[PDB]
Amino acid sequence: EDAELLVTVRGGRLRGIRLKTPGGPVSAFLGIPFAEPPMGPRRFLPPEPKQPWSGVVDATTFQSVCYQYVDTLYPGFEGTEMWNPNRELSEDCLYLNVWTPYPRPTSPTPVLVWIYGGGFYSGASSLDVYDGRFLVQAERTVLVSMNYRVGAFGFLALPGSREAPGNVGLLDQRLALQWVQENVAAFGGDPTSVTLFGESAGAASVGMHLLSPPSRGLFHRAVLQSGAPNGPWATVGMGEARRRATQLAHLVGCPPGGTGGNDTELVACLRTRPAQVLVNHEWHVLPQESVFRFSFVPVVDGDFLSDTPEALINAGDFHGLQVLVGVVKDEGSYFLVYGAPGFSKDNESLISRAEFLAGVRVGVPQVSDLAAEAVVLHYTDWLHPEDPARLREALSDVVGDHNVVCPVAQLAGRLAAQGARVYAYVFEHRASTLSWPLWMGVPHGYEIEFIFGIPLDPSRNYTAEEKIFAQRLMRYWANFARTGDPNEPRDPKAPQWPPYTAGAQQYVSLDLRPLEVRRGLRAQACAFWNRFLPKLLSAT
Amino acid sequence: EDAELLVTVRGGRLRGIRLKTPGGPVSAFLGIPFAEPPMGPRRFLPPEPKQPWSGVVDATTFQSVCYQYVDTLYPGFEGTEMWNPNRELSEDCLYLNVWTPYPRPTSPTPVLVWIYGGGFYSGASSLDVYDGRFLVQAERTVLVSMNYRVGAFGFLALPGSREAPGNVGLLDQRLALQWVQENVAAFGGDPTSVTLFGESAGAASVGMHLLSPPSRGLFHRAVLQSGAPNGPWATVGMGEARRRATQLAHLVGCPPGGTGGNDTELVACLRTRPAQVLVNHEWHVLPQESVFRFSFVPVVDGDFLSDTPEALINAGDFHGLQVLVGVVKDEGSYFLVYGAPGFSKDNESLISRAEFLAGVRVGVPQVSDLAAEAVVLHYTDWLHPEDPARLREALSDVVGDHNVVCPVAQLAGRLAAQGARVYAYVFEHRASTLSWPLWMGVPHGYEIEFIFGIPLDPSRNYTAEEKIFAQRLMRYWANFARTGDPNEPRDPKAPQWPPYTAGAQQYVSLDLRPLEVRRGLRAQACAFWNRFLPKLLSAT
Numbered sequence A, B: 001e002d003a004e005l006l007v008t009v010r011g012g013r014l015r016g017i018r019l020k021t022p023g024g025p026v027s028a029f030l031g032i033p034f035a036e037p038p039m040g041p042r043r044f045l046p047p048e049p050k051q052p053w054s055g056v057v058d059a060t061t062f063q064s065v066c067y068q069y070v071d072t073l074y075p076g077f078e079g080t081e082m083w084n085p086n087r088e089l090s091e092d093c094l095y096l097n098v099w100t101p102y103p104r105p106t107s108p109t110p111v112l113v114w115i116y117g118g119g120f121y122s123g124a125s126s127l128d129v130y131d132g133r134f135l136v137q138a139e140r141t142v143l144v145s146m147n148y149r150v151g152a153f154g155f156l157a158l159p160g161s162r163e164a165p166g167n168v169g170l171l172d173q174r175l176a177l178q179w180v181q182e183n184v185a186a187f188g189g190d191p192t193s194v195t196l197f198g199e200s201a202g203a204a205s206v207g208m209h210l211l212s213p214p215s216r217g218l219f220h221r222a223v224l225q226s227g228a229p230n231g232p233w234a235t236v237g238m239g240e241a242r243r244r245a246t247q248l249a250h251l252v253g254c255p256p257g258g259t260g261g262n263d264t265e266l267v268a269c270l271r272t273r274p275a276q277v278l279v280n281h282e283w284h285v286l287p288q289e290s291v292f293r294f295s296f297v298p299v300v301d302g303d304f305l306s307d308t309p310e311a312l313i314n315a316g317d318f319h320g321l322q323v324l325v326g327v328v329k330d331e332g333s334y335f336l337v338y339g340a341p342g343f344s345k346d347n348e349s350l351i352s353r354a355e356f357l358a359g360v361r362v363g364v365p366q367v368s369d370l371a372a373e374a375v376v377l378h379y380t381d382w383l384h385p386e387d388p389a390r391l392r393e394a395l396s397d398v399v400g401d402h403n404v405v406c407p408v409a410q411l412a413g414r415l416a417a418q419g420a421r422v423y424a425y426v427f428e429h430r431a432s433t434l435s436w437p438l439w440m441g442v443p444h445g446y447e448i449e450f451i452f453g454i455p456l457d458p459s460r461n462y463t464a465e466e467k468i469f470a471q472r473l474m475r476y477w478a479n480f481a482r483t484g485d486p487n488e489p490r491d492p493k494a495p496q497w498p499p500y501t502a503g504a505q506q507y508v509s510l511d512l513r514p515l516e517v518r519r520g521l522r523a524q525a526c527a528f529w530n531r532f533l534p535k536l537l538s539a540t
């Protein structure tokens, strides 16, 4: 009862709240501080553990959202606003959340840890679609989600210097993982059965923790949904990270009046600026020329990542690891309305031939003029080279394959061939309540509703089939968190989910129909990006 | 007492509210409906007069703001968000407001009518800087301000057709002027002493009412602040208006695939779309390539404007008309931040020369390469052709002269030479509470707060000299409204404000110093725009 809404951790006491689901109650502890607020002289610095507190911290509501750009492409639109901050912005934002079943588990229960997406420039654990009350009630697992610094506050990097080392947003997530190790037992969770799962930039973070030794010891399984650390958008070099950080300082007036520009006086000048000022100039340090290119992302400093993600994946030993990777059916359609010519969510987006040739440039940026042509060859149907509907879905594939599906398949194949046990999926159900246009199909990020059991919310108009479907998906994710295998341990009735190996390359389709095994995560198209295109780009 | 907060007009009864100033109370009637709500089948149509109502309409708060794009360039910034809507958005927005002194004037009192600016795409009568409580208390005049439809809802035009005739936003203002003729007497106002005053697009609107015979009979004086109808941004051709309206229909899916659209089926399709959907695609109608160019502006159809504003100003007879025109000192700096390269309000905007040549293309669009060169070579100081600070002020003058100062001076000269009595000013005081950077000087729109006596608000950190300066400014505007002459009727000791003539070209400087007469509203620069540039543009 209300006695179970009181919990003591290594820092102090907490009072949680009881959440209601149609199948029973859940105990939530929203707003637990896990780090000292990274404000003032602590801006751009690695997080420090929260010092113990006196009294009872209130943990009945979500805390502040980290300072971030707010999307204004379609004001008043549910499809874009559902990802916007739903609490007020503040640099004081390093807080995590723990859901636990009622009654509290008496035996150590596996823990799922969620990491949010949003290009490393946005995101919050308080979004309605990340509500863990349905996943915890239905599968009796422990769910943990943290906030990490995004944008410049999380990933502005002057490499080498100690005032702005970079990747502090990744260190925020790591500290929250150390917090789970030291404190999840008090909530009934098993610190030896921790399964990370993220989406988009969250999946890239999950993968970047696999490739970082200090973070690897803090978890045991990984789930990467529509994202991977080896993506062309998920990392940046040291020289470019220095250029962008210096450019942002110039846009806000640093250094002032022509004084010195060494990294000490530059960061000190950046620390005196209001947080909103830095955010208001985030998308200027890029040419734009940018969908799918974000200003401040993890850098290859040599610290958090001793080498590039692709190098660490190719040389990695992954025995004893279980991974669940997957993508949605139409990864790239969500990103076309952000600058691809001829595209608009309010019409059919029937683009011309010339608009397709220009859209390849914003979808695949920083590419040579001849390499952009090989993309047009590979994705043009030459029996219908002018059909606008086919060109629309072609550019969607160009952007989806280059940025998500093929970086994921490249990672999934290397893991299975080097000791890891890998399961792959492709989410193919379009929600009956989706506000995006029909031509986008299953857009990026719209499998999250069903993983978190949001259809079970009685205040939402989901179908009865989507409720059974969401419950089936939650069992898949929970079974993987418990046993490292999405298949039910004692049920041969349901169709089986075979592992993904580098040879057969088997995956299953996730929709209202029973499971169906297929071969190849866009095997033909991804050979163009993973195998041929580097050979062509290196010939200069 | 409270009996004066009750007034009957030709439509019904109203209950006003009493506003407080540090020098006495004011009776305000905010939210008076003057037209039937232009919703449903009445979208894009000329306004119909409000039907009489039963009971007492509440007139104690501002009504809704007309649907308009919300500026998001600098979120959380006072300088931009002070012009953003401060009431809920609705197509039901045709309401006006009346301020009147306490006690109510017993004899007919002159009436000032305010028309807000905002490039015909934004603006509202409810903004705090348009609060008429200080002008009415200090000068005992009657102040009226209306809302008019902006953007596509006010100025989308398929010329010729009757489903979308265009200029309905100008007809909104005219209906409010006919309302003042029929009802301002009930508030103590003189319908024979009505003085229009607007700013930016409001000043452009005031000028278009001078050039429209039906609107000319509803007022007797005019004040044009930082705007004129003959500006390169205030009008559009019939062919471009049709191209712009058709483009907006395509962006929202009109007409549906498999259907052709005449002017009827196209507007019928546009009338079924939510208002926010039309707003979300307003800026895609033009290339952008756009500061200083707005999608939906008054069209030259032959109806409201029998010819272009330039033609009607030249052939116009203006005897018996008093006009007060003026500009601010730095008309162009506010708009550079909206697209000129190298410009940022948070640094010094010390642009290179390459950025200067590029900025001329954005500030002066739609001109040939030879024409752009003549602008660069005319505005370059050749002893310092690379000084960034001089290039910044140069580009500020380039867009300030081309869009505001020279259209005003061109208009002011033609009026004084064809019968009108004209007074000119240049506002040269930068408010002590201004949130824009110092290098913007006196930006566009920041004389309004002194005309409306906002410094008198005791909850604002204005200086004592600005309070005296604000009171002195309101007297000029009130004296012009009463007598058609800003000079004090019987105060010969104060410096005099001589009329503006086409030859002497005299104006006064408005700042904390007493009046100083000067000659030439940028006479050398405006000769380049008004006299030579048309001749050079006759060369393809």
Ligand SMILES: O/N=C/c1cc[n+](C[n+]2ccc(/C=N/O)cc2)cc1
Binding pocket: A283, A290, A291, A292, A335, A338
């Ligand atoms: O006129 N300015 C338009 C404009 C629009 C959007 N942004 C920010 N932005 C860019 C890309 C993406 C990609 N998301 O997948 C998200 C957000 C800046 C400026």
Ligand SMILES: O/N=C/c1cc[n+](C[n+]2ccc(/C=N/O)cc2)cc1
Binding pocket: A072, A073, B283, B290, B291, B292, B335, B338
């Ligand atoms: O995410 N969208 C950003 C964005 C959308 C549309 N514009 C066009 N625009 C031009 C001029 C002005 C004001 N001029 O004074 C206001 C707006 C710019 C940026």
